[PDB]
Symmetry: C2
Subunit: 48 residues, 2 copies
Amino acid sequence: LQIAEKEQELLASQETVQVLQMKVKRLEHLLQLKNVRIDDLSRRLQQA
Amino acid sequence: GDPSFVLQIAEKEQELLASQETVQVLQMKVKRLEHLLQLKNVRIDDLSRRLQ
């Protein structure tokens, strides 16, 4: 059907969404890692 | 009869549209997260230089 085609287009999109959601989650972990590096470097600067 | 089918396909097309826009917004969120990361890398390089 028309509906079989529309449901297959949506499934492909819903999986594209799922991978983008995991990429955002990994980017958010990176940012947390970068905040720790900043706090490390900043503390070691206060040792001046 | 056929009006049920007009509505069924309208529903399926609206579910797909919502997904295709969810994709579009996640793509913009990734772009914003990438800008943040670049900003954090510059702060790290600033702080690091000032440590030398």
